[PDB]
């Protein structure tokens with residue numbers, strides 16, 4: 001699981017790998033209200049649930 | 053001109069600073085922390101290393117009982133075993149079939165490998181932070197190396213720089229650490245002179261070249277086995293040969309905040325905690341007078357395509373009318389949008405192009421282009437890749453204030469509810485007034 | 492038998508502790524802190540020594556004009572003066588009376604003689620306390636030295652002493668200190684590379700052999716006088732020669748708690764703050780079985796003289812009858828009356844005398860000779876001398892246990908007032924009783 005803090009993976013004697021997550025989502029933020037709330041749900045789930 | 057700014061203590065992300073000295077064209081500084089280092093003040097407690105038991109040749113008395121001596125050696129232990137009858141290769145060593153007593157003695161001492169193979173137990177008092185920085189001073193990359201304790205002002209190209217102190221006193225190390233060769237471990241090693249057998253520190257020494265040795269390995273001798281001249285004993289194995297297999301991961305791999313660890317001296321590089329107060333002293337000659345810089349008019353923007361991914365997913369096109377040719381420092385008035393460039397060349401009746409990185413679903417930001425602002429607006433789209441290998445170029449998560457246009461649904465519904473409540477309140481208050489008029 | 496006790500951190504004052512173990516005769520240890528040392532961990536910042544101005548011979552250009560050249564000397568400064576007409580011993584130097592110029596150049600460097608006359612500014616993080624102790628073991632003085640951080644265990648006469656940690660972390664050193672030979676001053680020296688002219692630190696070097704010199708003496712060249720080839724200048728006098736005659740008082744004259752301060756390494760010796768928790772772990776061979784100890788009956792004490800004069804001003808004569816000759820460890824459990832000796836030979840039916848020091852205005856206390864208890868009572872006269880040169884050899888505590896035996900005035904007055912109050916309350920109760928039955 002890659003959190004927003006980022007993940008560092010060291011594999012054997014290789015140099016550690018670093019991974020960070022983007023703001024990818026399936027919804028759209030300029031369409032119908034269900035679409036935009038789904039978008040903000042995929043981005044920030046807890047915050048969007050509490051605010052709605 | 054003394055300028056003071058604070059940037060987050062994050063390595064490798066090129067930040068931006070604005071120095072708006074009045075009467076002079078605005079100055080944009082692109083500073084990038086190449087490395088920050090924390091170095092605790094060590095205080096060696098003792099040096100541990102694998103011991104060795106020193107067993108001199110046993111003394112076997114052909115007749116009568118040998119006498120046990122006494123010494124002050126670190127773990128000296130003597131014992132007298134009676135009734136022995138040793139055999140050598142040719143025949144019986146002792147003349148008489150009994151009454152022979154063997155004097156077995158042994159003690160411990162540091163091994164020869166203690167010079168090279170050893171583990172140092174220290175104490176970490178307080179780290180003297182140091183830093184190295186890259187700044188695009190006057191549009192050219194220059195590097196600045198200085199301490200980060202609020203002292204040691206450093207100069208380059210006549211411009212002073214003094215950085216720190218770090219807003220975070222957090223250090224990866226604890227009050228006690230050990231180092232083996234390049235690995236450092238936080239562990240609460242036993243007090244000197246009280247090492248338990250088998251565990252780490254059964255034998256302790258102040259320095260590798262010291263002669264005083266404290267060793268607690270419960271060396272116990274045992275009776276020779278049925279006509280042989282050996283000296284057997286029952287000693288707890290080395291606690292350091294055991295620790296070496298039982299080490300576990302060192303701080304290089306377990307420390308938080310993406311902390312690196314080095315040795316000679318022990319450091320902690322590129323920790324991500326806190327922010328860096330960086331204060332510059334930019335001389336008057338560095339600035340250019342405002343009349344010298346050009347003036348831009350009729351600026352119209354456009355965003356052909358935008359994507360709110362990290363690594364500068366947006367691109368904007370701005371028309372211009374720049375009067376004289378010169379260096380037009382470009383800047384972004386909005387925190388949420390970080391434009392890539394720091395200055396471009398403008399002259400004529402044409403347009404330019406920029407790149408920016410944002411986390412907003414709807415672009416809304418003002419571009420400071422050589423004292424003349426401009427408004428840019430576009431709809432950003434989500435990225436296609438779930439994860440990437442670099443930290444986000446843009447500032448941070450958009451705060452709850454900044455939603456996306458077509459949030460107008462929120463305003464619509466809240467206005468409708470407020471309107472309903474308003475008509476309800478007006479009806480109630482007019483009824484209350486007319487009922488107050490009764491009698 | 493491990494026995495943890497605490498003694499006050501005062502140096503040179505003996506303290507008696509009671510080690511009592513069932514089945515063994517009680518043991519009393521007389522211990523006395525010989526010295527306590529605090530060793531700060533130093534992280535040198537920079538060395539300051541008086542500068543020297545290096546003025547090369549002037550370049551007077553005959554019938555021409557010279558030009559300034561730029562270099563990166565620590566405080567380099569050059570100027571060109573026109574219209575000069577210098578002379579020499581034989582005659583005028585330049586051919587023409589006008590159009591002559593002189594190039595004056597100078598900079599500053601550390602005095603290469605000042606590898607000794609330097610003052611070094613440090614930082615002090617924390618002190619590794621170390622203590623040297625003298626304990627009276629079984630009628631023998633044995634001296635023990637150990638670290639006072641509680642992380643050091645030593646041994647002598649097969650007895651293990653672990654001393655520490657210090658109760659108080661107070662140290663006479665601030666974070667930033669300077670040392671000059673034997674003197675050390677708490678002062679917030681200017682940060683590196685930002686020294687002020689004329690004050691301490693105008694010329695800063697990292698280490699006395701390091702070649703990087705930061706100097707801020709505001710050297711300013713001046714116009715040569717008419718017809719002379721000298722190179723005049725205006726420089727702020729050395730800040731270190733100015734400090735040397737304005738230092739003030741070293742810490743060994745200013746620090747509180749009667750602190751004593753030394754250097755190389757810097758130390759704070761014999762602080763009077765806090766208390767020292769000394770833990771003693773003693774073997775069973777040292778003890779003596781209760782049956783093996785003498786038993787004394789019919790102990791009666793008489794005190795012919797007593798004076799609370801800080802130097803054992805009382806003498807108590809104790810009659811006794813003892814079973815067998817032996818060593819009885821006398822002790823006083825009244826923690827206001829210290830007694831000098833810790834054991835005395837007993838035999839048959841004989842007397843003994845002890846010397847006790849108190850501050851009580853009426854000496855009333857119990858003495859445990861070996862295991863039996865005797866009660867002592869005496870009257871104290873105040874001493875005649877107002878001043879003594881040694882710390883008091885006893886302790887002072889709260890009032891309730893220090894009032895004279897002639898405090899009977901307090902009891903009489905309080906009892907009389909209580910009696911009259913009780914009588915008034917009883918009369919009021921009786922009057923209420925009839926008034927509660929008359930209605």
Ligand SMILES: CCCCCCCC/C=C/CCCCCCCC(=O)OC[C@H](COP(=O)(O)OCC[N+](C)(C)C)OC(=O)CCCCCCC/C=C/CCCCCCCC
Pocket residue numbers: 033036037040044047048051052449450451452453455459461462
């Ligand atoms: C038909 C239906 C269609 C309708 C469409 C539905 C729309 C649905 C969506 C709305 C979008 C919500 C998603 C926003 C989430 C963004 C993430 C975020 O929001 O997180 C921002 C930061 C990061 O999170 P953190 O844990 O690091 O920070 C807290 C640190 N900790 C824990 C120590 C306290 O958090 C912070 O800094 C926040 C700090 C607190 C900020 C207070 C907000 C200021 C305003 C307050 C109300 C006043 C009214 C203003 C009105 C004025 C108008 C005139």
Ligand SMILES: CCCCCCCC/C=C/CCCCCCCC(=O)OC[C@H](COP(=O)(O)OCC[N+](C)(C)C)OC(=O)CCCCCCC/C=C/CCCCCCCC
Pocket residue numbers: 887888889890893898900901
């Ligand atoms: C006819 C009858 C004849 C009989 C007459 C009998 C005589 C009566 C005698 C009493 C003798 C007292 C002797 C005991 C004294 C030893 C106590 C002690 O060992 O202490 C001494 C310390 C040492 O001085 P220093 O310089 O180290 O400390 C100050 C530090 N510097 C200077 C930085 C501020 O002095 C201190 O600290 C003390 C600090 C605190 C003292 C104030 C006490 C506060 C009490 C308040 C009571 C409140 C009333 C209750 C009412 C409630 C209603 C029911």
